[PDB]
Design a protein around this nucleic acid. Structure first.
Ligand SMILES: [Zn+2]
Ligand SMILES: [Zn+2]
Ligand SMILES: [Zn+2]
Length: 359
DNA sequence: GCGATCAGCT
C-alpha cells in the first residue's frame, strides 16, 4: 500500500499521515475514505500542526466539506485549502528548519470514485507525476481529460501512482456506471410499483460513493432515499434533496449493526416492520462488484440471492481493461501500484504495468 | 480513557 511519498516530490505527503509523513511540507487528501486517512488525526500530527503554522492540507471542496463534518477532524478546520477541479494552482513548499523553498503546480482531476475524489497531477522541478488516488474511469476517459494534454497530445509524465485494486486479467471487464444504475433502477421500479407496502433496502457499506445510485433512483422514481445521517451533505444540495431521515419512503439505505437479523424478521434497519399496521414487503439489494473475463459472455448485473435478496453490480475501482487503457494512453516512464491486492504480488502487478510504460 | 492490532463479520 502507498506510504504517502512519491520519489520525485518526497516533501509532500498524499493519503498517508503517519511515520515519515509527519515531516511533510504539505498534505493532500484525494478523497474521504478511512483507508486514505491513516494518521490524519494522530495526536502527534495535531501537535506538529500547532508548531509548524505553514503546513496545510490540500483537497477538493467536497472532500473538505465531508472531512470537516466528522468531529474528530475539526482541528483541521483552519488548516485546509480546497482547490477547485481542473484549475492549475501553484503552491509554495517551504522547509521550516532549513529555509528551502520549492514551487509546484497541482491540478485536481475528477477520479469518478466518490464525492470529492480527485487525481493529483503535479508539475515542478523533478518531472510531471500523476497520483490517481482511488479511480474508476471508462475506456478513453484519460484521452478526453484536457489538463493531461499539451498541444493536443498527452503530457510527458515521468511517473503514475495508480489504483491497482483490480490489476489482474481475472477482472477483465466490469459493467459500466450506467448499466449498473439501469439494472438497479429497473429492479426497484418492478418492486415498489406493486403496492405502497413494497419497499427496497439498499444494503450499502458505510462509506462515500453510493450517493450517485441514491440520486438517480430518487430522480427517476420521485422517491427520496432514507439514510441514518445526511448532515455531512447539509451544504451540498444536489445530493441532500435526494435523501431524507423521514422513514416514510419505499427506498431505504439506512444501516444498523443487526440489519441482517432485522431483515430475517422483515424489519428495516431504521426499525419499522409496517405502515398503518400493514406489514411491509422488503427486498434487499446489495451493491457487489462483478466482473467478466475477456471472452465477453457477460451476465445480468442483477443476481437473485434468495426469496427477497439481490446482488447488484457496482464498483468503486477501474477494471483491468480500464487500468490498461488508462496507463497505455498516458505511457509514463514509470507506473507504481498504490496497492498489491491479497490475490496477487508486486511481481505480477509490475509484469502487467511495465509493458504499458515507455519502451 | 485512548490508540493501534486484529478476530470476526459483513
Ligand atoms: Zn476509496
Ligand atoms: Zn480503497
Ligand atoms: Zn430506513
Amino acid at each position: 500500500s502507498f506510504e504517502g511519498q512519491m520519489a520525485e516530490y518526497p516533501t509532500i505527503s498524499i493519503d498517508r499521515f503517519d511515520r515519515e509523513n509527519l515531516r511533510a511540507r504539505a498534505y493532500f487528501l484525494s478523497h474521504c475514505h478511512k483507508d486514505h486517512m491513516k494518521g490524519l488525526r494522530a495526536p502527534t500530527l495535531k501537535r506538529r500542526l500547532e508548531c509548524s503554522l505553514k503546513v496545510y492540507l490540500y483537497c477538493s471542496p467536497v472532500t473538505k466539506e465531508l472531512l470537516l463534518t466528522s468531529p474528530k477532524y475539526r482541528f483541521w478546520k483552519k488548516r485546509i485549502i480546497s482547490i477547485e477541479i481542473e484549475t492549475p494552482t501553484q503552491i509554495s513548499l517551504v522547509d521550516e528548519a532549513s529555509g528551502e523553498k520549492e514551487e509546484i503546480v497541482v491540478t485536481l482531476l475528477p477520479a469518478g470514485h466518490c464525492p470529492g475524489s480527485v487525481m493529483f497531477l503535479f508539475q515542478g522541478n523533478n518531472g510531471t507525476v500523476l497520483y490517481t488516488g482511488d479511480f474508476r474511469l471508462a475506456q478513453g476517459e484519460a484521452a478526453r481529460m484536457e489538463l493531461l494534454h499539451s498541444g493536443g497530445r498527452v503530457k510527458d509524465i515521468q511517473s503514475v501512482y495508480l489504483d491497482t485494486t483490480f490489476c489482474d486479467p481475472r477482472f477483465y471487464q466490469i459493467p459500466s456506471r450506467e448499466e449498473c444504475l439501469s439494472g438497479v433502477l429497473e429492479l426497484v421500479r418492478s418492486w415498489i410499483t406493486r403496492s405502497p407496502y413494497h419497499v427496497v433496502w439498499l444494503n450499502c457499506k458505510a462509506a462515500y460513493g453510493y450517493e450517485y445510485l441514491f440520486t438517480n433512483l430518487s430522480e427517476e422514481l420521485g422517491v427520496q432515499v432514507h439514510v441514518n445521517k445526511l448532515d455531512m451533505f447539509r451544504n451540498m444540495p444536489e445530493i441532500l434533496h435526494h435523501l431524507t431521515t423521514d422513514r416514510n419512503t419505499q427506498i431505504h439505505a439506512c444501516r444498523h449493526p443487526k440489519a441482517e437479523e432485522y431483515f430475517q424478521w422483515s424489519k428495516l434497519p431504521c426499525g419499522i416492520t409496517s405502515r398503518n399496521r400493514i406489514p411491509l414487503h422488503i427486498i434487499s439489494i446489495k451493491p457487489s462488484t462483478m466482473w467478466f473475463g475477456e471472452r465477453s459472455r457477460k451476465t445480468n448485473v442483477i443476481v437473485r440471492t434468495g426469496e427477497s435478496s439481490y446482488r447488484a453490480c457496482f464498483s468503486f475501482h477501474s477494471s483491468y481493461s480500464e487500468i490498461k487503457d488508462f496507463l497505455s494512453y498516458l505511457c509514463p516512464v514509470n507506473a507504481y501500484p498504490n496497492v498489491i491486492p491479497v490475490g496477487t504480488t508486486m511481481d505480477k502487478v509490475v509484469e502487467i504495468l511495465k509493458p504499458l510504460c515507455r519502451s
